[PDB]
Design an enzyme around this catalytic site. Sequence first.
Site, short mmCIF file in Angstrom:
data_model
loop_
_atom_site.label_atom_id
_atom_site.label_comp_id
_atom_site.label_asym_id
_atom_site.label_seq_id
_atom_site.Cartn_x
_atom_site.Cartn_y
_atom_site.Cartn_z
N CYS A 273 0.83 -1.21 0.00
CA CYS A 273 0.00 0.00 0.00
C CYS A 273 0.86 1.26 0.00
CB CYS A 273 -0.94 0.05 1.20
SG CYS A 273 -1.90 1.60 1.22
N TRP B 118 -9.15 6.70 -0.81
CA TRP B 118 -9.42 7.49 -2.00
C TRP B 118 -8.43 7.05 -3.06
CZ3 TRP B 118 -8.10 9.91 2.67
CH2 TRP B 118 -6.72 10.17 2.82
N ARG C 297 -0.09 4.68 2.67
CA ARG C 297 -0.08 4.42 4.11
C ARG C 297 0.36 5.61 4.95
NH1 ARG C 297 3.80 -0.37 4.85
NH2 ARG C 297 4.33 0.17 2.69
N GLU D 192 -4.69 4.02 -10.65
CA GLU D 192 -5.47 2.80 -10.51
C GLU D 192 -6.62 2.80 -11.50
OE1 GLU D 192 -6.04 1.30 -6.29
OE2 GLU D 192 -5.63 3.43 -5.85
C1 HEM Z 1 -5.90 6.59 1.82
C2 HEM Z 1 -5.80 6.41 0.50
C3 HEM Z 1 -5.24 5.10 -0.09
C4 HEM Z 1 -4.56 5.03 -1.25
C5 HEM Z 1 -4.19 6.20 -2.20
C6 HEM Z 1 -4.20 3.65 -1.47
C7 HEM Z 1 -3.50 3.17 -2.55
C8 HEM Z 1 -3.19 1.85 -2.77
C9 HEM Z 1 -2.66 1.30 -4.00
C10 HEM Z 1 -2.35 2.10 -5.28
C11 HEM Z 1 -2.49 -0.01 -3.81
C12 HEM Z 1 -1.96 -1.00 -4.86
C13 HEM Z 1 -3.11 -1.94 -5.19
C14 HEM Z 1 -3.39 -1.85 -6.65
O1 HEM Z 1 -2.83 -0.94 -7.32
O2 HEM Z 1 -4.17 -2.70 -7.16
C15 HEM Z 1 -2.91 -0.34 -2.46
C16 HEM Z 1 -2.91 -1.57 -1.85
C17 HEM Z 1 -3.37 -1.85 -0.58
N1 HEM Z 1 -3.82 -0.96 0.38
FE1 HEM Z 1 -3.90 1.02 0.13
N2 HEM Z 1 -4.68 2.90 -0.40
C18 HEM Z 1 -5.35 3.76 0.47
C19 HEM Z 1 -5.98 3.38 1.65
C20 HEM Z 1 -5.93 2.15 2.27
C21 HEM Z 1 -6.69 1.74 3.45
C22 HEM Z 1 -7.70 2.65 4.19
C23 HEM Z 1 -6.32 0.47 3.74
C24 HEM Z 1 -6.75 -0.50 4.86
C25 HEM Z 1 -7.67 -0.21 5.78
C26 HEM Z 1 -5.33 0.06 2.74
C27 HEM Z 1 -4.69 -1.15 2.67
C28 HEM Z 1 -4.18 -1.68 1.51
C29 HEM Z 1 -3.96 -3.08 1.22
C30 HEM Z 1 -4.23 -4.24 2.20
C31 HEM Z 1 -3.46 -3.18 -0.03
C32 HEM Z 1 -3.06 -4.42 -0.85
C33 HEM Z 1 -1.91 -5.17 -0.20
C34 HEM Z 1 -1.89 -6.56 -0.77
O3 HEM Z 1 -2.53 -6.82 -1.83
O4 HEM Z 1 -1.22 -7.41 -0.12
N3 HEM Z 1 -5.12 1.11 1.89
N4 HEM Z 1 -3.32 0.83 -1.87
C1 LIG Z 2 -8.44 1.30 0.24
C2 LIG Z 2 -7.82 1.39 -1.13
C3 LIG Z 2 -7.57 2.62 -1.72
C4 LIG Z 2 -7.00 2.67 -3.00
N1 LIG Z 2 -6.75 3.85 -3.58
N2 LIG Z 2 -6.68 1.53 -3.66
C5 LIG Z 2 -6.91 0.33 -3.08
C6 LIG Z 2 -6.54 -0.93 -3.82
O1 LIG Z 2 -6.35 -1.92 -2.82
C7 LIG Z 2 -6.31 -3.24 -3.18
C8 LIG Z 2 -6.31 -3.64 -4.52
C9 LIG Z 2 -6.27 -4.99 -4.84
C10 LIG Z 2 -6.27 -5.43 -6.28
C11 LIG Z 2 -5.58 -6.78 -6.40
N3 LIG Z 2 -5.60 -7.22 -7.80
C12 LIG Z 2 -5.01 -8.57 -7.90
C13 LIG Z 2 -7.00 -7.27 -8.27
C14 LIG Z 2 -6.23 -5.94 -3.83
C15 LIG Z 2 -6.23 -5.53 -2.50
F1 LIG Z 2 -6.19 -6.45 -1.52
C16 LIG Z 2 -6.27 -4.19 -2.17
F2 LIG Z 2 -6.28 -3.79 -0.89
C17 LIG Z 2 -7.48 0.24 -1.82
#
Ligand code: HEM
Ligand SMILES: Cc1cc(N)nc(COc2cc(CCN(C)C)cc(F)c2F)c1
Lengths: 415, 415
Positions: free
Chosen positions: B113, B285, B116, B290
Amino acid sequence: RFLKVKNWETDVVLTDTLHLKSTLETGCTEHICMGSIMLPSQHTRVATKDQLFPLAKEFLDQYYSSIKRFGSKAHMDRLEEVNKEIESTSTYQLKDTELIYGAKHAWRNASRCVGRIQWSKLQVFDARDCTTAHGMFNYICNHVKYATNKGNLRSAITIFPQRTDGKHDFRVWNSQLIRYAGYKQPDGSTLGDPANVQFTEICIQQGWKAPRGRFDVLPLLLQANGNDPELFQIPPELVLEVPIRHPKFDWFKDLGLKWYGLPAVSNMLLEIGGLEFSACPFSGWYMGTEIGVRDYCDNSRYNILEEVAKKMDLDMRKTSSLWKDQALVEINIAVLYSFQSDKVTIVDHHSATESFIKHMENEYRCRGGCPADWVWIVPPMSGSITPVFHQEMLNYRLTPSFEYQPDPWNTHVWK
Amino acid sequence: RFLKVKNWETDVVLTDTLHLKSTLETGCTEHICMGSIMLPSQHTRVATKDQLFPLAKEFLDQYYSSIKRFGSKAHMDRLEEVNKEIESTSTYQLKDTELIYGAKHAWRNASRCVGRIQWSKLQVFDARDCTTAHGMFNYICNHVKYATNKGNLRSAITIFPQRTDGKHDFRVWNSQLIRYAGYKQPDGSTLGDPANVQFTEICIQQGWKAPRGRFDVLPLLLQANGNDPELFQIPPELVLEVPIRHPKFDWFKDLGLKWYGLPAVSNMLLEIGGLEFSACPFSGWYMGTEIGVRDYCDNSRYNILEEVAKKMDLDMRKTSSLWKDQALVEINIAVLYSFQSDKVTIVDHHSATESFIKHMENEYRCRGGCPADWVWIVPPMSGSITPVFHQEMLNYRLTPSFEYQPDPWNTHVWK
Ligand code: HEM
Ligand SMILES: Cc1cc(N)nc(COc2cc(CCN(C)C)cc(F)c2F)c1
Ligand code: HEM
Ligand SMILES: Cc1cc(N)nc(COc2cc(CCN(C)C)cc(F)c2F)c1
Ligand SMILES: C[C@H](O)[C@H](O)[C@H]1CNc2nc(N)[nH]c(=O)c2N1
Ligand SMILES: C[C@H](O)[C@H](O)[C@H]1CNc2nc(N)[nH]c(=O)c2N1
Ligand SMILES: [Zn+2]
């Protein structure tokens, strides 16, 4: 014991058994992954006679397996022969054919190399008879000329004598046979390539008269058999250069950019059968993004997204106007266009990455796997619109290999 | 035992001691790195009473270390208290404050993430009193409303009752609370989001009357305490959507694109003190890429680089015209522009990645490290012009954590 890698864009699934042959470690443990450390302690390179025969045996057993005559008498003889020579001399020598195989497979095994579909078509110049910096310079010049082939670039490596004791060591001190100079300024800014400024001063230290522009091709600094390195200027007629114009923006000529056609990495170490070739310059042809993205647009490289976006008349106030992204795509359109219009071999990051997926298919079929470093295989722009972004890659270290090695001036006991 | 990560653009060096606290494995061994396998067997999720107290003790010792009162009586009492309850009930319950800490730190520990930097400002809705799909739907609706905050988005997670036996299991079957439907066509092509077609049919299976367009927000399918899931339509007034226009190309309205403001991941599993919360939708957000890169431009997603580049009037004959790259930058300029002009919280991949480097500095200072997955932190376009490209990241698995889990329909014993 038969791992699986999936492409999430095509649902293709390959099965990697080749990693079973893997030998050296990676830096990752069960509880930490270091797949994004640049130069891990494993990827950087003194060996004894004891360890030298397993590595000799391992390499030879696969070389004869390669030419279909494994376990035979010519194999068993060559094992005894090198065994005997490693007793006698606590080192050994590779047959010309064992060098060509070894080298080709160090390239084949380079997991960070996206252009490996061509690994078999590598030209090996055996420079193991070399003894002087002048001989090096001559071998290196014939490399440059041959691999350049008037823009129709060819893959090549020139292999100088293997390390022995360690204090008699052939080294190209250049990081590449052709790189532009870097000079710091009064205000501390940088003219040329900031990457090389340390090297540019080491050249002026040893007597280089710098023309003190941007795109000044550096001289060669050649360490031969341990002696102090010596400056040599590649004949300019041998250094082919593409001036960078854009196929729309006529003000892109006035940017005044150009690059050398030939990427030729000189500062690394070729490991074959436990033998260390400290000087082994190798060359291919560029992927467009290495120049357009990394060279031209890295912050501590030429850093031109500034001046380019200005002339593009771009919303540079906001970070979120994506003006940096906009000026980056044009800069790479210009590099590819420029190189193609001069009949100089270049590949775009889309074509290069599809060929690598095609290559990965061959390697998991006719070899059982393909070590791949995703952190390095994914082009540094438009990652996900290229098919390597979506392909899982197993990274492991096979041998023969190319290894990083410390820069000579940090280690060279001087005069 | 005190590892070092370098930024090769700034020469900044951080020291990671936090990985010493690391618990679960990664998939990498000494002789293979799997840093690019999407869903490793480690990242996917039945536990017994024996294992449940170490995990309870470990979590509690850090929660009291967090509020500065570690090892004290309120600590030692809470350890006995949960020990006693794990003897008595072979499970236990988290204090409201232990849930809020636990959840926040599962986000903090999410190494994939990039956003964070905001981990501490997370809103936790404790829905552990929920018992019906209707109660879920009500909790989820108040989540949507609160986190959406009329475009001024807020981070939130809603935590449904923890897994117990395993057959009484709360699950959102949606991968996100808001996703567009996907319908296959006569010719086998796809209208809507190809990612969801499997899910879209499961909804029509259970009775969803599909309007059969592109951007049809799917209903919620809510499994409560193991019973069969039930369809619920989020009130449309609660699903905020940004129609995608470009700040130059007036034909970009006629593209007719739009996205939901709220990314809200619903299908994953929250692990706190060895306790498994199988339903725990969480929302933040968007980063622009994405939507603009992955959603709109992945091949097996909306796949619009075709129609966009057409209207841009682009050299689509040659792969090396970089027309795909050109049409990708515009598409992301449009997404960011559109979201900002509607006062809907969005972040560009430059701002998001600088904040993450700023966040990494905080985490190696006031925490000793920051688990980071480079393969996932680097934006999927313009990788190297963003500062995360040049930053080495140590990846390790800390807990509390978010874990993937199998989709419910592959496991749900039906009626
Ligand atoms: C606050 C704004 C946030 C932004 C801009 C953001 C952005 C991202 C992005 C770009 C990814 C990569 C996933 C993808 O591209 O498909 C990701 C993954 C992730 N985020 Fe964040 N996120 C946000 C909030 C959060 C929140 C609120 C949580 C948990 C309560 C969180 C937990 C995670 C987790 C668990 C993953 C994926 C990790 C995995 O697949 O092992 N995020 N996030
Ligand atoms: C809260 C939040 C904000 C944000 N801006 N973007 C995200 C994207 O989070 C995730 C995306 C994927 C796609 C995984 N792919 C293999 C389909 C799997 C996860 F477990 C995630 F937490 C989450
Ligand atoms: C034929 C055309 C070739 C292309 C397009 C190509 C492309 C690339 C690219 C883009 C990289 C990533 C490095 C970076 O971006 O800084 C790379 C790395 C590398 N390539 Fe290739 N290359 C070619 C030929 C060769 C040859 C001829 C050899 C060896 C004889 C070779 C061996 C390597 C090695 C050792 C690395 C770096 C691996 C590491 O750092 O561990 N490549 N190549
Ligand atoms: C033959 C060839 C063709 C090509 N098109 N590109 C290349 C780039 O190869 C390398 C680049 C670097 C830069 C490493 N960075 C930390 C400065 C280190 C290496 F060891 C390489 F082999 C090589
Ligand atoms: C920190 C990180 O390891 C470093 O920036 C790497 C990432 N991936 C790369 N990939 C390629 N092809 N070339 C590079 O120089 C790098 N640099
Ligand atoms: C094969 C590879 O693991 C897969 O494509 C990953 C790569 N990195 C990613 N990074 C992010 N942020 N999101 C993703 O979906 C992926 N996909
Ligand atoms: Zn690893």
